[PDB]
Symmetry: C2
Subunit: 256 residues, 2 copies
Amino acid sequence: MKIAILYREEREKEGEFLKEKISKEHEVIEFGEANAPGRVTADLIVVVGGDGTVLKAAKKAADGTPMVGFKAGRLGFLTSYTLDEIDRFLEDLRNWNFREETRWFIQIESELGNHLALNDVTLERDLSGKMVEIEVEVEHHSSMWFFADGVVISTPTGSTAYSLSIGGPIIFPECEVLEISPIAPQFFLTRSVVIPSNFKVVVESQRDINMLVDGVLTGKTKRIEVKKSRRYVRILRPPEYDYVTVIRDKLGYGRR
Amino acid sequence: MKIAILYREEREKEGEFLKEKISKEHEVIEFGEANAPGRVTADLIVVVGGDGTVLKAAKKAADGTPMVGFKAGRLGFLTSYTLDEIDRFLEDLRNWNFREETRWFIQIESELGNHLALNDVTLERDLSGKMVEIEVEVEHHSSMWFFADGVVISTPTGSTAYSLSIGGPIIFPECEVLEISPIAPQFFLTRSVVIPSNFKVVVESQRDINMLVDGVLTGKTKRIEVKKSRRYVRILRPPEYDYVTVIRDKLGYGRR
C-alpha cells in the first residue's frame, strides 16, 4: 500500500518514527511538512500533528484521499490515534478496519477570489472599528439583519471551534447543516441559526470588514457567498472511535 | 452663565445651531471639538453628539464642572436632551431645574502609563491571534483563570456597552460595583463576575495583547491594575429623565 506522511513543524522526528514503523508493511511515497505547498496523492495520508495540521493536510490532499491523524500537539476532533496505539493502527490498516467520516468543505466567493474552508469563515470589524450592519440572506429568503462585530459561518466540523466560544450549538459531524453565528450583536441576538447544507448564504456588510478563512486573515470585503463544496476530506477512524468521548474530554461538555 | 460647547467631529452644524440659541440668553466662552486637548472650565459644559462624545468631554471637564449632553436622534445613557429639546433645556437652565448625577471613573495603570475610563477597559487578542491565558486576581483573593479572546473590565456606566454585547448583566449606574467579563472563553465560562467598587483588580495575560480604553485603542500590554478613581464627572438631567425608558428604547430590553 502507498502512503504519504505529513508532519507539523517541530514534530519531524516523530514523523520519522512513524515512517519506519509503517515501512515494514507499506511503501511510504512521500514524507514532508504539512506546510510545504503541493498536491499529495497516495492511497492514504498519515498526518502527525493536530486539527490545525490535519486542516493544512486536507487542503493538500488529492480529492478523495483518506487521511489519518496521530495526536502530536493535543487532543482534537480530527486525530484518530495516539502514538502508543501505532500497532493498533497497523492492525486496523492491515484489514482496512475503519469507520470513514466525510468532512466537506465550504466554498467562499468574494472580491478576494475563491476560498475553501473546512471549519468556518468569519467577517469581523477592526479592533478600532465601530460595530457594523450585517445582512444575512439565506437561499431565496428575505434577510436577517444584525448590528454586530461580525458573523461566523460554520461547518459541523468547525461548530466546536470559535462558534462554540460565542454560544453556538455542538453539532455532530454527520449533520447536513451550516451554522450562522453573529459576533457580539446588539438586541441580545446571540443565537445561532442552523440551515440545511444545500442552502447557500450571502453575507453583506455596510462597510468593508476583515475576512478570516479557517482563522487566517485574508483581506477586507463588503460581501461573500458561501456554500457547501463537493470537495471533502475523508477521515479514517478506529472502529471504537467515539466523538462523544472527545466532547467530554476536550470541550468539557457533559462530564459526570 | 458662562458656557462651553463641545461637539463631535462631524456635528459642527448641530453645535452651531445649539450655539446661536444658547447665546441669546447666555455666554459661549468656548466652542470646539470634544476630542481636542485641554482642560475646560466653565459654569456648564454643553456637549453635542452621543455617549462617545460625552465620554471624551468628561475627561476634559475640570473636576466640578457640571455637564449636559445633546444627542442627534434617539436618547442615550450619557445625554440628557435631544436636539429639538433646546426649548425645555434653556427653560431648565434658567430655573436650574435639574437632577444632579455623579459617575466615577476607573483608574488603569500598566506598562503604557495611567489611563482614565468612564466605561471600561478591554484586553483583547489581535484578529489574527490565538486565544490567550488570562489571570484575573481580585483585590485579596486567589486567581480566576480563563483561556479566551480577552476580558472587559467595566463600570456600571460601561455595563451597557461592550460588556452587554458579550453576555454581561445590565448594571444600574448607582451600583457600587465593578464588572469583569471574559470575551469568548472556552469551557462555557460566559458569565460575568461582579465585585464591590472598592476592590482593585489585576489582570495578567500570557502575552502582550491589545488594550482598549473607553473603546479607544491604546497599545499592547501584558498586565493591568484597575481600581475606582476619586475623579468623577457630574451630569445634569431634567427631572423627567428616566434611565429605564432608555434601556427599553435603546437597548431593546424589556419592551411591552
